[PDB]
Amino acid sequence: GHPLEFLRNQPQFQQMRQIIQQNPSLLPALLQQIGRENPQLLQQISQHQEHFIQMLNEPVG
């Protein structure tokens, strides 16, 4: 229940979650890449970091 809630069931995010759960080592590079592409998303991620991370690591089929 946060600004980032709307990403939860987006297709491209569901795919992002499957990849990040199966490639934890890619988290820093993700955070970094989001920082380039989407400065405002990186910031909202920072305001509410644990929420975002819980979204990313929630399993999806």
Binding site: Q10, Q15, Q18, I19, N23, L26, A29, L30, R36, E37
Partner: protein, 290 residues
Amino acid sequence: GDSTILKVLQSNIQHVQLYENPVLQEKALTCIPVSELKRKAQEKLFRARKLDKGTNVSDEDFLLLELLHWFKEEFFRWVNNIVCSKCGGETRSRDEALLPNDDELKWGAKNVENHYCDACQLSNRFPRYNNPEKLLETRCGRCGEWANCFTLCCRALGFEARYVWDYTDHVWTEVYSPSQQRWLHCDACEDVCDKPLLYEIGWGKKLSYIIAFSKDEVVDVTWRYSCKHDEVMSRRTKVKEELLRETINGLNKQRQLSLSESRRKELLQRIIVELVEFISPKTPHHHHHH
């Protein structure tokens, strides 16, 4: 399953193997004035770096821009209705399609079009060749033939290329920029590079599913081509999002079994870039024209 989206994933995944064949690529170098595209790319490269504000380098990217241009201008032609064989004039489209005779089937034409001349009472034949080796000779058609042949051509020059299938009946190409560490929209057919919102914002197209296909991967690239992801979602009513994802993963994982470790690692590092863009929808742009 029986959904047509999934049935096209598999033809297209199959179909796209044909470009990687150095036999066909050879045949597609016979056609291409590289020496000149590649040398006009360097001359535009040397001067661009005088205004070094221009960041990146771009190089095989300048060549990419010459590749599109050449294709549009010297190589491929656009077919509206083909001209009459007999009298050379205007023809009109008959909705009852011609049955493909035999040679036409051999070179991959399932649908053949009746371009009727009223003056001559002559049916002219516009075959719709799937086979890119035939298109090197026919050198014409619409977006299918143009994307299909232009993708063989990218591969022919050692480019990382995808065939990109839009559900609403347009197709094009994606080309990897080592330079920019990203995939690039290429529409030879419309002479455009790296303007993905051409279709939705330029054309008012109501998009749904856009799937890219290469020797390495299948990727749902929909989100590159839109800034109205909610509306796109509403039209994604053909298949479960789970089932589509499941099926592309299945296909990538099966068809990556025969790739290298480091290669597979390069791929997962790129896919992060794409995926970040797909969650980074642009702000809805007069000229997707000019």
